[PDB]
Amino acid sequence: LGPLYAIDAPFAVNLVSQNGRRYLKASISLELSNEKLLNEVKVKDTAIKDTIIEILSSKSVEEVVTNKGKNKLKDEIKSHLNSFLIDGFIKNVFFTDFIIQ
């Protein structure tokens, strides 16, 4: 059980809506694999926010309402952040707020 790191600014993106305009709002926490990564994730906050925004803004409503979609989502977030982190890796991704408008 590693250090648990909340991203304080909530995320708010457009989903792909080929009929209307639909919005995802989501509060995300990351489980860190070790303490050393805690400074790296603070240093790389901007990069991390840019990657999450690209992942979430690319999905459709159908792709995120099911649990299989949310779990696809978490794995995508883990692996894209883990492609550039160096001092550790993301163990788990947690939503504490998730809602579509």
With vertex at residue 3, the alpha carbon angle to CA 64 and CA 87, rounded to the nearest 5 degrees, is: 90
Partnered with residue 30 across adjacent β-strands are: 5, 93
- For 77, the domain range is 4-100
Q: This structure's resolution (angstroms)? A: 2.7
- State the SS3 of the chain: CCCEEECCCCEEEECECCCCCCEEEEEEEEEECCCHHHHHHHHCHHHHHHHHHHHHCCCEHHHCCCHHHHHHHHHHHHHHHHCCCCCCCEEEEEEEEEEEC
Single out the residue of 29, 30, 27, 31 nearest to residue 10, CA to CA.
27
CATH of the domain at 38: 3.30.479
Q: Among residues 101, 90, 85, which one has the least CA distance to residue 13?
A: 101
Total number of domains in the chain: 1
Handedness of CA 88, 89, 94, 95 (dihedral sign): positive
Strands 4-6 and 23-32: antiparallel
